[PDB]
Amino acid sequence: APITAPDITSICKDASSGIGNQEGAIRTRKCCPPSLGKKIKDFQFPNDKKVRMRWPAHKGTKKQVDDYRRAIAAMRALPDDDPRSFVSQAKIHCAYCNGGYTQVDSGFPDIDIQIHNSWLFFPFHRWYLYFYERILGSLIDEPNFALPYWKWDEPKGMPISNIFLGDASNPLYDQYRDANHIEDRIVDLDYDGKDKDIPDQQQVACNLSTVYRDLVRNGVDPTSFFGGKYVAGDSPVANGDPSVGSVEAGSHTAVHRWVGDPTQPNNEDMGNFYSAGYDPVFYIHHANVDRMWKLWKELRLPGHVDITDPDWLNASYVFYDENKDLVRVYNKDCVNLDKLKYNFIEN
Amino acid sequence: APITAPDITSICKDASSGIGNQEGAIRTRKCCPPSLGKKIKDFQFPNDKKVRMRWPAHKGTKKQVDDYRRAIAAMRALPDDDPRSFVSQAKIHCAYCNGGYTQVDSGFPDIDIQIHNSWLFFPFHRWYLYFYERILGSLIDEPNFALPYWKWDEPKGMPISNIFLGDASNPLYDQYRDANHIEDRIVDLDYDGKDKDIPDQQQVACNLSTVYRDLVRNGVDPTSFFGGKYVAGDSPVANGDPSVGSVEAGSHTAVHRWVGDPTQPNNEDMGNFYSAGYDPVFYIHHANVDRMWKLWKELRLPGHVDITDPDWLNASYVFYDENKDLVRVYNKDCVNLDKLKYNFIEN
Amino acid sequence: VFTTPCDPEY
Amino acid sequence: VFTTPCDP
Ligand SMILES: [Cu+2]
Ligand SMILES: [Cu+2]
Ligand SMILES: [Cu+2]
Ligand SMILES: [Cu+2]
């Protein structure tokens, strides 16, 4: 049977899984979403006139950059308890990744839902960003708003983009990042917790090698790319499990570790699920992770196909949308980007 | 039905295929092997006490380099029509690659045999080198003689080894190489006819990427790695045909094109099959190509399996051995390096 | 994607 | 096993 998120406004508990130092945590663990008296609606495919074209963070137009920056500013200006607010959006990741919800709707009320370390990884984050992106556009009246994506598979996109830097006046900035690494600028997609100390050009080549490793060498079929089968009744799969998919465990994990501030008690923000969403670059990293799913299919190699298992197709989550409605979404409905009315600008 | 070499001492014609400027050709097209009254006998697995360990050309010991150099000197000193001679060994490549033989034994006397640009590529050259190596060792009374190999998949192995350089006083030297490229030293495994103007470290990374491409990205099953099916009744597959296997079309082709002297009418020696064997480095490049087959299987990725089609298994060629005996060899018998009594020194 | 060190745009 | 730029 499929994993099924509950009514997240009725059954929810504070996050207390996957956080090593709870008492010193620099972000909240009270990650439950607000109650507005909304019913949960079924997803309807969007009627957008134009496809939202996500843009590489290092090569945006002025309008793309300004729209994104202004939208984040608007999101940070919302009241805290607005489900669209900066902290409310961060809390989503905390709730779904650090034990906010149970499998009560599947007949397992005492087992948590975890969306990481399994085949839920890609579609959960796809939907999360889908609503996040539509929310941002709505806050600034840009009906065709698209997120940037951190194109760390392309040499000039490998340095963390200047748009995220500066200090507190920049809506896109976050003080809780590894200062040494921000100085180095160029992300290490092969980062294992030890700095490599190599020429920039070498790191560039290593990153490209790492992308090919995740997408071709290790992501040879749906099990190895998307991650292991995770169904009603299962307990959470541990970080580091061999069943975790290639991208999730590889380049994905590396960027989180590398950006996260090791001087913080849980390497906040990017270094732990529960806090990662307080870094604007979290979502923009994940937009490129989202893109990897697209690229992986476009490789046209044996095994590079989507999942057809009903227990994956019929798995569902609940999110607030740009109208503060609650929406239930299914994995099956995010496999086709044309139908979700976005894609990514490619060379 | 399998491609089957005829009695190469009875049915053979001057090479006339795949050589653009034959009137100006600097090497002979009279590539047919000598007649010595021998009967063709089937291959028997060798009884060598020890496995011959092929050595990286940039890391040879004194004895390895001296023995190789002396063996090539001995081979060069032989009368041309000795089947073990420098010229005779070069001519083998010409005869099999440039139309010396037909499919007469299969009922197609009107169709040439071509061993390139198909699944015959790897086993033909494996056998070619097998006898070449045994011949060289016999000339210097070294029963465990092993070829060097050009380890262009390892950064320090990418420069053409200085053992091949100098002048005609060096038996391993060939004047008919691209002088600009020899000066550059580092081979471009992605060479496509125009010099990249890039730093050495970038070329190293390019070469590493190319090996990854040939062995993992494009070599995903036997058809794409070994090359297309080619059986009796089939016409010769053209140079550059997309059905050619990943290594043959890729790194393999690049090294030939890069070493071949563009000032020569057919880019002799390495720049055309018919002349490539007059460059001692031809065989040493091909020793690493041979190793790629080993490495490809060691990867243990889906599809990295040997061919089981009888029309491949039972394809055969004829070679002179170190006793000036005529031996018929079959693809099926060369898949296991232990049984051929050689391998490669690895890290 | 498919950027490599061999490419001129690298 | 082949060499990659990530390796020492
Ligand atoms: Cu997540
Ligand atoms: Cu993540
Ligand atoms: Cu050949
Ligand atoms: Cu060749």
Q: Where are the domains of chain B?
A: 1-347
Q: Burial of B110 by CB count in 10 Å (0-12 exposed, 13-18 middle, 19+ buried)? A: exposed
Residue type, A297: K
Q: Is A231 helix (H, G, I), strand (E, B) or coil?
A: coil
Whether residue D5 contacts residue B157, with contact meaning beta carbons closer than 8 Å, is answered with no
Between CA B123 and CA B133 the distance in angstroms is 15
Residue type, A94: C
Which chain C positions have a beta carbon within 8 Å of A208's beta carbon?
Answer: 3-5
User: Comparing C-alpha atoms, which of A252, A259, A315 is closest to residue A117?
Assistant: A252
For residue A132, report the distance from its CA to the centre of ligand 1, in Å. Answer: 13
For residue B242, report the distance from its CA to the centre of ligand 4, in Å. Answer: 17
Between CA A87 and CA A116 the distance in angstroms is 20
The contacts of residue B192 (CB under 8 Å, 6+ apart) are: B254, B257
Which chain C positions have a beta carbon within 8 Å of A297's beta carbon?
Answer: none
| A to B CB pairs, distance under 8 Å | 31
The structure tokens listed for B38 are 């021998």
What is A1-347's CATH topology?
di-copper center containing domain from catechol oxidase (1.10.1280)
Let me know the angle formed at the C-alpha of A326 by A8 and A286, rounded to the nearest 5 degrees. 80
Binding residues of B: 93, 116, 125, 252, 256, 286
Please enumerate, as own/partner, the contacts of C5-9 that have beta carbons within 8 Å and a separation of 24 or more.
Answer: C5/A204, C5/A205, C5/A208, C5/B198, C5/B202, C5/B203, C5/B205, C5/B206, C5/B208, C5/B209, C6/B190, C6/B196, C6/B206, C6/B209, C6/B210, C8/B196, C9/A347
Peptide bond into A80 cis (omega under 30): no
Q: Is B313 helix (H, G, I), strand (E, B) or coil?
A: helix
Conformation bin of residue B162: beta by default, left when phi > 0, alpha when psi is -120 to 50: alpha
Alpha helices (H) along A140-250: 179-184, 200-212, 222-226, 246-247
How near does any CA of chain C get to the CA of A247, in Å? 13
Which chain C positions have a beta carbon within 8 Å of A153's beta carbon?
Answer: 1, 3
The structure tokens listed for A220 are 């040879």
Binding residues of B for Cu(2+): 93, 116, 125, 252, 256, 286
Residue type, A287: A
Between CA A289 and CA A270 the distance in angstroms is 15
The structure tokens listed for B228 are 């297309």
What technique was this entry resolved by?
X-ray
In sequence order, the β-bridge partners of residue A102 are A112
Between CA A137 and CA A70 the distance in angstroms is 10
The structure tokens listed for B104 are 């007469």
- What resolution does the deposited structure have, in angstroms? 1.6
CA B93 to the chain's CA centroid: 8
The counts of H helices and E strands in chain A are 12, 8
Conformation bin of residue A337: beta by default, left when phi > 0, alpha when psi is -120 to 50: alpha
Between CA B302 and CA B304 the distance in angstroms is 6
Residues 1-8 of D with CB under 8 A from B: 1-5
User: Is B265's Cβ below 8 Å from some Cβ in D?
Assistant: no
